[PDB]
Symmetry: D2
Subunit: 217 residues, 4 copies
């Protein structure tokens, strides 16, 4: 439809962590039906970021997930109008981020307007001390609630010198028009920073995602 095998992405994120503001812009491309995407991100304000870049990366579109034909695709159906999402990310040490993304479509380019805010990260914690390595792969659980789509996922950051730092995501996705609602399902994800410069002013980010129905029977 309005969706093509190769799509472009443009974004601006504005935000703050522990009261310190920053802004990031990004350009990328993705393959909606392969569930793969990548982009280049540049910090424009507030650099160099004094916190772990990893907390931001999942804020940078479930349109980029490979949906089998037997699972309703809330996201691909929502276009050209698009959809928005809201997310809380609650870290096990009391750090908490919340983010929004309003996703629109211009030609073959998705446009993100993102807001990201985080508070209560301990000064000596892995986020403020930049001790994170990457997010582990994950499996998001998606279900309908109040006529919109919810997605929850147990996330974990691998830490420098071993161990994990846990975060629970609760996302609400809201199509901008009426679409068919899916049954309970899953999306496996794996997000990776493929490259970055020393202070993360420049980051090349990649994600691979595939929908499924879990173990049979």
């Amino acid at each position: 439809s309005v969706i093509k095998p190769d799509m472009k992405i443009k974004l601006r994120m504005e935000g703050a962590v522990n009261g310190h503001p920053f802004a990031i812009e990004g350009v990328g491309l993705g393959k909606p039906f392969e569930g793969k995407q990548s982009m280049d991100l540049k910090v424009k304000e507030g650099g160099p970021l004094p916190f772990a870049y990893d907390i931001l990366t999942t804020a940078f579109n479930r349109v980029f997930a490979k949906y089998p034909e037997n699972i309703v695709d809330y996201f691909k159906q929502s276009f050209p109008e698009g959809y928005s999402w809201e997310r809380s990310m609650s870290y096990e040490d009391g750090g908490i981020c919340i983010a929004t993304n309003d996703i629109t479509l211009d030609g073959d380019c998705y446009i993100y307007e993102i807001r990201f805010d985080g508070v209560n990260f301990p000064a000596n914690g892995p986020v403020m001390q930049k001790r994170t390595v990457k997010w582990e792969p994950s499996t998001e659980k998606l279900y309908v609630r109040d006529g919109v789509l919810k997605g929850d996922v147990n996330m974990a950051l691998s830490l420098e010198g071993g161990g994990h730092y846990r975060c629970d995501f609760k996302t609400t996705y809201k199509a901008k028009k009426v679409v068919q609602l899916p049954d309970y399902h899953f999306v496996d994800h794996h997000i990776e920073i493929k490259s970055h410069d020393k202070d993360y002013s420049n980051v090349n980010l990649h994600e691979h995602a595939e929908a499924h129905s879990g173990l049979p029977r």
Copy 2:
């Protein structure tokens, strides 16, 4: 630098469920009486589509009556000032976080506030504007990592009865080294004294007093 009568000026920028807004306010308070009041005007995003009550505690613990026997982290922090960060986790999964950077210009406190909220259910009391007021509360304050924490069980009274619970966790950070208090309490009571129909204009009042709980 702390006078019995002080002025207040603030600007809040924020968003609730992705919907941006901005509010400015002017007020006065009596730091030693633990009382303050202000007038707030919505400047952008009005008429606000969510319960104004969720915003009100974001609109300064310097306005709390501290007894002599309890260290006052807040009054000590001036003229440099202090900042706070707050999570406000509601029982239905709605969640707000806010920050306030507080500085002092003459006899006027200046607030720069950011407020963000997500995951409020469309049929919940916040988006449906079914709140009446916050109940009075007692905040529990304790030192952690060289800064001051304050946690409080909050409750909104609901139209036609019952309550809607919210857990506050605040971190307060003096901009200079100050003496740190022992575990203590602050009783609060915040009230919208008047407002126009869609809350474009709101007169807000708070009264707060520190104590050490049961002997």
Copy 3:
């Protein structure tokens, strides 16, 4: 059926991290003064391998001084009595839940208590016995679904400084229809007044008073 001096008898059975134990206790209290005390003996599973403090608030809100202007859900509930259920969620992921079924025999309250806790980290303050005492607290009470709820931000003082936070959520259920109170508070202060080396024997005291917060 409520006398100025009342007796108490209890048995608690429980487990912490899969390790079972049992404790019995005898005491006396003054319902109208909001004071009580008791002596507790570990009968099984001793010496307890976890901080005794996590148990103590499980060991009756009838022992709270209620002003005339606040409905007393608890004193009304007798002679039939009431039960409570409680979750106690600690900041490091440790979590306890407890129940108490309270009946009255003559001038003696009888408690049947179940206490269970899991997920306490081996190097955390509970398994390492690094707690000193609970701080005083203010519980917030409100009606929900025709029964009484009580939530409280609790904190344990830690050996060598700092605090370890726990969130209590309690549901109280009268065994007969009683008049329901308006939103209110109960201040608390619980203290182990004495104990032997491994807490096989503990003398415990609590003082509690209801109020309506800042006017």
Copy 4:
């Protein structure tokens, strides 16, 4: 080793929900390497259960999960000594259960001693009103913490007449001897009540579970 392709199971659970005590016994069999098991459960005390049987079912052994050779199997290694687990199950309406299981091995029979306790379930909620249909399939996230094994999972109960009732599990698994510790990994699960009589005094329960490493790259 001490583990065979076909193993037996015996259990006793004692517990309480909202202060009301009950007890359940069970006999079953499982295939550790196929990640499949089934059992028959009988309520012995406190019947007929006045709450949704579904809240109990996951308390009724990760030995019954198919582990690939490239993922360390904490559970199979822990025998013959065995291991224990502790679990909190936090429901979105404030209901909360916690359970323990001490698992030992006698011959070719696992023996469970289970404790289950739940409180704060609303009188008009799906648990006390018995409005649950089944658990959805799930993906548990497993990671090492403090030299033992953690497993967290986003769970959901399908509800009578549509929608879902969410529960977050946090489990700690503790081998009774030193074993090799795994890297971060996943276990897909699907638990099902295959049959039951009217008041659930008798229940035939089945689970299928398989370990994996999530999306590649």
